[model samples]
Target: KEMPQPKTFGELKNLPLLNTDKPVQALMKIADELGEIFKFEAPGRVTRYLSSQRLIKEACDESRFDKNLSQAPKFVRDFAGDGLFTSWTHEKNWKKAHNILLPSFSQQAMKGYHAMMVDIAVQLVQKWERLNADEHIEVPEDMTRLTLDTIGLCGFNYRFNSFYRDQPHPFITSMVRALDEAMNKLRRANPDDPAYDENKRQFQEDIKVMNDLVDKIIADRKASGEQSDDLLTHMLNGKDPETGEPLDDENIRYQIITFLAAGHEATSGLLSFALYFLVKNPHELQKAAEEAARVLVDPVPSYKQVKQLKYVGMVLNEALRLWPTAPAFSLYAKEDTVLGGEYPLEKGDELMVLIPQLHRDKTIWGDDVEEFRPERFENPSAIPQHAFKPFGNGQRACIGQQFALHEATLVLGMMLKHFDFEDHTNYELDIKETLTLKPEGFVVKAKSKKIPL
Candidate 1:
């Protein structure tokens, strides 16, 4: 099918991308291509529209054409950035932030958080015990609850009871809705002017609501006046391991938001995907349970035990390769740099680096990239580090990566211990490309595997 390159937001202002004609499956392939989506200031429909548009803007920020994607809608561009750091978006921030944050998820830190993960995973399985034998678990829909719990309990010391109490959280609700609206407007945008006079009224109100929340948290932290071990605490009081400069609040906020959002549901989807994989391969799940049980016979395994459960790592890695948390990461051209030794670029040119496509690229991982092979990670020394990333790579890689991995491994291992996944409807899950590419309601039967207590 030929693609239409609409000229301005006016051409695209009315397209219903959220529930629209252009499904994500249609444009997900080229949506990340820098020149087409971000550089031409092309006004056309795109996929996974919400998140992709935002990424397109950031990726193409360096290449400022007359009506670039940033010029598409006020709602998209307003108060997006302008901080002490870049105060703008582009590849520079990606480079800087990746350098600033990647170390947070280092092998050492990931190893350190192993015990916290064991506790979180054990708790999750305990919750699952509430379900009856024939209970039809809504794995896809409710996975976020577990993921949120995992992030809150394991990511930090914060108390987000979304999962424990099964209630909607105020901050979680606002943040998710705000990002959704912002992304939607960007996709529907016409090359409108700087400010949408109509939208600004509501924008200020929404922002104030969010600001007040941030302010409150800041205040609470100040009032506490004590040291803590949470991710936020480390970030807030952390020193650059090399330079020893304490990370400023502005830097801290970006890290907080990035980690929280990425950690919250991405891991849940990962767990769900893991379930989907294990369900299809009953023998694989059985083997995983045995490994976890044998390794962690301490009953409620300590953090040290996570390291020895090598098989558990492979299962999580396989799911991530299949469905990367974020479908694509867009990079804005910082200068008039050349890429692939070809296309000439200017500032603000966004290049969408599609992880899903990259993970699926037969050229790299070969045919196995599309297949779920848990054994893939068994020999980590063989595969390149950049090839398979659920959290992402480079300086902008997720800060909570360690916490997330720890939480996921334990929770998943415990679940495997409790349930026997049979090859019933053992097909690849339905991928709903929402904020992230998530499995759309993976329905797996969970028959209990009686274990010797």
Candidate 2:
């Protein structure tokens, strides 16, 4: 079957390129015009994108297609190495790390981490409380602080203490620089660019900053000799069940880096977007605030109380549906085959699943697909399988899905309970991307709620 693609030079130029500043939005616009499936060719890459649930379901069949570590994920490997999130499917370390770390994210383990999550959430609340009533909070920035601190404390017993400082932790700044370099490398492959030397030097320095911080965490853990139940302890003590091989120090470092890098960003974006949606939809915001007030009777939410924040969860799910923070994932055929039993695909041809468009499919979500109605998830079971994939698909799905959700729910519950948000600027949603998508320049004025629940 003939696949859809750009037919003219103008259309081709309009198609997303390797360096498209807003690739997710551009791709969604293209999906609207190009229909279910389309392909685009870049220098050495011939990639097809699937934006419909039917096509995604066909491509998601594990027996036929496996996760492809191409494009952005490939660039991430420069720093993440063979870490859990960035590792190829066939890598032994991926399987081994998956086995060792799986238990740490289990329900029981989440209970263990709840207090730490609250600890950071409390810090965020306190920080917000201190802000002047007229202050415009940077939604994504604060959310990033909250998630980063939660992950650092829960995963490694370390503290980024992002809230205490005007600037983010040096580790975060270095990481952002490194990631910028990586994305730039993708757009322009030439080493001959005049600024490449200075950029390369800075990249190397940024990597060292990340590595040194991770190494210190490991060294401190080893030196302490105390038994802790954090992720660091899990990796240090866990051995592969099948092979009985324990993770070496280098692999442990990579895992820590992976958790820090992958753990915070998407969840942060989720919180930011949820707040944006709530502010935009005042009635929904009132409903969520009421739910939070009723459920979170106390300033700090108990584990049971957090679980009971049903509306907040719905809001988060709806937010994820609208703007899946990790907006896309890549996959490829296990063998030469036809997708949707029509488009031919070779074993290596990468297929990017555009989650934002998939979640908005009118066939599945109905006429109000663009609306921010949380009631769609009121009965989660009623939704069709593979129709909503904020997290990726199958066994390769996000391991920390529960962790991210729990943390976001707790923090958001508290935020709603304490404050009434106003969009003073009448701010519009502008997404910024660095491997993940977040609202750029989104700000809201948060006034403390005067009434007691």
Candidate 3:
């Protein structure tokens, strides 16, 4: 924070007091600076410490890692468990956890989810077009319903009818609130105190109720089982490579919760941004529509089809590049470590990489660091390595990365199919990037394309 001494992660590695008292919060603040503007480190952890000298050694050293580090505050860790993101690849316990969870996100299952997304996205744009912009119109709620329906159909293989009813899935609504400090306490409390136990109890109680809801569903399906093609069925039936174990209800609940909750919260923000970008650019939509016509010729785009729409990808990538949800990720070294070269870190030293600053850093993204140019994607050779990771790179990167892309492409393409999206002028846009990047005043109006199918 001291301007005289640059507090950027690279500069602060040697500052001793940073790790002295309530060290975790220091790491939290550091990561906050790194991730465009998030204040909560929450569930995932920072990248693991892999020394440059040991890159080859570590590659070959496949011995199991300690499980605890995988559960995290991004930069902070409980001595008992690893931070969530980093531990997945190396640690055994995390390996077990991911082993149980990863199968659910298999390529085939991912493809099916993309199929569901295409259907949901197409219907969403169509329904709005049928209504004259004035009647039954509220972009915020309507968008929520659209995504809730998408996730339910995709993840649960059941329908929640959120679009029709104005209510939250009891557990998920509570989860959004519960993860907040006002609604929930810091997940890791100092154990020497009595209050930690009470907070922990409450957290467990909430988790248990959520588990019960999903477990009952899983049980009902098995008792009078249905051969559904959604995520839940695949997860329930899928096996772990090491144990050949099928995911039980509890494991299923956590994963389903993670996938659904993450998608539910992030997508609207993304959709809203896409709308903002389309409106802001003035004429970007025409280029987008031409590309969409070529790609969605089938009306429902397949996974392969979405990839080929290079212009569409460019726009979304630029949106993500400009408004990344988790801008910079934070990490704490277990042992002394080195990074980006020349930075020496002692055991427990914190490393924070500010993603947006780096992404838009004139040096990496070229002189047009602030402009929204879709051509960046059309000509990616213009950029260099690790400069544009909207989704963090490597193994622990979001499992939903491809799913997000598929969903974005399908939704935008579908909207383009039915309507030419333009912003309603009276409403000014304001962006708030917290737990995730969100927009206020995301309202937009639809005009049918000059040529309709």
Candidate 4:
């Protein structure tokens, strides 16, 4: 049987422009009209967008399909360079780094990072405290700063001190430029355009800026002979259990930059989206606030206390479902196979799991799927497997899942404890993207909670 897709020029013309369109929104509309699975075509590429839980479940079968690092991921490789997030499945470094760094995200490792997470979270609260009550807090920007600083300190033993500075650190600035250009390159129709050459030149410069910063961090750590359990220390000293080979300087730099880049973006976006939903859904906000007050009796929450903020964790879960920061990941059939015993896929055909649409599938989430309901995630057992893959799929799942969630949950809990958020301007959710998704132009006013001394 043949799969569904646009049949004529008219239909093709109506398809959303990958470069300019808001992909999640546009694809949701398409899914609403086209049903669970449909083929999407761009200039020279053909992709199957899968939206049903059943199809996604079938695709998740590791025996038949494997993660394909194509399109935007390949573009990211220009800077990230075969790091964990962008590395091909067969790449040896992926396995080596995964083995070495897996423990860095363990409960024990998370305990180690918890204090630093709180330190950065405190910086955010203090920054908000100093701001005038009437000031419109830029949620995304501040969230980015918070996560970046947290990861910098926790992962690299470097301090971005983003709160004290007016502008982001040079690493962040270069990263933003390089990532923006990477996405831009995906949309470019002409490789010969004069602007393309200029973009190419600046792109390399941006990569150099990031490389130099990471190299300096590595060198400084080695020079100081720092004895810490942070990521930089792990990469420098940790060896693969099987081969016992340490990561070379270049690979170590890739892993460091990868952590810095992948670490901050999605977690920050998660916090931003979680705040957006909380502001829009006041009842949920009240529930989360009450939970925060109950759990965070101390000025700074302990690791155990942060874990106990279950409702806040649920809120972050729901946020990821609605707007997964790293929205879609591509998979390819390992061999010729038919998905759901209907859609025939060749060995190398790319199938992109449309998470935003999959999350709202009527079959899985019901008609009220559009509602911002954190309570849906209250019982982890109730959610269907493969239906809520915000991190990613299979062996390639995000190594920083626990780290990101803990950081987001801790930050949200503290913010809720210290302030009251209100949508003073009646803002609507507007998503922006680079390598990840965030609530663009989202602002709110935070008033001090004014607890008794």
Give the winner by lDDT. Answer: 2
Give candidate 3's total backbone clashes. Answer: 14
Model 3 C-alpha RMSD vs. true structure (Å) is 7.0
lDDT of each: 0.57, 0.87, 0.57, 0.85
Tens digits of lDDT, candidate 3, 1-453? 211121424433333323332333354344334432222222232233221121212222213111122222322121112323434455554555566656556555566677677667766766676878564345655665777678878877767666456666676565554444221232333434786666556556665666677667778888877877677777767777897766556556656666655566567667667667777886787888888887777746678877677777788888887766554444445566543344444565443444555556554567896688777777877666566666655555566666676677777776776676656665576655434565665776777764333
Which tens-of-lDDT digit does each residue in 151-195 have in candidate 2?
889888988989888888899898877778877776664657887
Q: What is the lDDT of residue 166 in candidate 3?
A: 61
Worst 10 residues of 4 by lDDT: 7-16
lDDT tens per residue, model 4, 1-453: 566774434444423456463756677677788888988876566889888898998988889988898777787788889788888778888888888888988767899999888889988888888888568799999999999899888878888889878878888889888878877776666667886888888989999999998988888888999788578888888899977888888888888788888888899999999999999999999999999999999867999999899999999999998898988888988999988978878888889898888898778888898889998898999988899999888888889999999999999999999999889999977888778899899999989887531
User: Residue 64 deviation, candidate 1, in Å?
Assistant: 18
TM-score per candidate: 0.75, 0.96, 0.74, 0.96
Candidate 1: stretches off by over 4 Å: 1-24, 28-41, 44-104, 111-116, 154-156, 189-210, 240-245, 248-254, 335-338, 341-348, 422-428, 450-453
Determine which window of 10 residues in candidate 1 has minimal summed lDDT. Answer: 65-74
Query: How high is the lDDT of residue 27 in model 3?
Result: 41
Q: Is candidate 3 or candidate 4 better by TM-score?
A: 4
Q: What is the lDDT of candidate 3?
A: 0.57
Segments in model 4 whose C-alpha atoms lie over 4 Å from true places: 7-16, 451-453
